[PDB]
Amino acid sequence: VNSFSGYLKLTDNVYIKNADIVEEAKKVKPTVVVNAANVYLKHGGGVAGALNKATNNAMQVESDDYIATNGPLKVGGSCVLSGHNLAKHCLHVVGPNVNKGEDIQLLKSAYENFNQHEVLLAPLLSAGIFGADPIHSLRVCVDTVRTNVYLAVFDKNLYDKLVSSFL
Ligand SMILES: O=C(O)Cc1cccc(CNC(=O)c2ncnc3ccsc23)c1
């Protein structure tokens, strides 16, 4: 029994809710929040810009030190950093950005990173400004992630379509 509330159950291990992931993180303070990162950990916009803003830019400062030491992530890769005021940990996961011509097949690899964590609060990878079809992202999530994932979908009309079209 954990502290997530108001989610619709899609499968044995995948749950979904129409929510702002920032507000959900501040309310639940989960062990792991997933960021929709890019390989440079430049948290400008979308989920990343919103999470970073909620940390008063501390996420960006930590991220810049990580990149200065380690170099960029891979598309499909991840790193674990602090969750600051929002979570114990932030798992920064890089889904492919369709708007940059990255291979959508890397979306499955991106979701595999979730399996290293028992429970996560997460957005749909490669959705929103990353340009992939969110219905496809949800299907890859369900078919790839085996740990317990609580998906926060910002847009209510998308959250209604995702739930109504779910197989
Ligand atoms: O909500 C999120 O977490 C990510 C997000 C945030 C803002 C705007 C979008 C873009 N909207 C959509 O892709 C969308 N909307 C409504 N019906 C559909 C049906 C197929 S795509 C689609 C996505």
From Swiss-Prot:
* Cellular localisation: Host endoplasmic reticulum membrane
State what changing residue 31 to A does: In strain: Mu/B.1.621
* Activity regulation remarks: Inhibited in vitro by GRL-0617.
Per UniProt, subunit arrangement is: May form homohexamers. Interacts with N protein.
Limits of the Macro domain: 1-167
Domain of life according to the entry: Viruses
The catalysed reaction is:
Thiol-dependent hydrolysis of ester, thioester, amide, peptide and isopeptide bonds formed by the C-terminal Gly of ubiquitin (a 76-residue protein attached to proteins as an intracellular targeting signal)
Function text = Responsible for the cleavages located at the N-terminus of the replicase polyprotein. Participates together with nsp4 in the assembly of virally-induced cytoplasmic double-membrane vesicles necessary for viral replication. Antagonizes innate immune induction of type I interferon by blocking the phosphorylation, dimerization and subsequent nuclear translocation of host IRF3. Also prevents host NF-kappa-B signaling. In addition, PL-PRO possesses a deubiquitinating/deISGylating activity and processes both 'Lys-48'- and 'Lys-63'-linked polyubiquitin chains from cellular substrates.
What species does this protein belong to? Severe acute respiratory syndrome coronavirus 2
Name of the featured protein? Papain-like protease nsp3
Q: How does the record say this protein sits in the membrane?
A: Multi-pass membrane protein
The beginning of the lineage is: Viruses, Riboviria, Orthornavirae, Pisuviricota, Pisoniviricetes
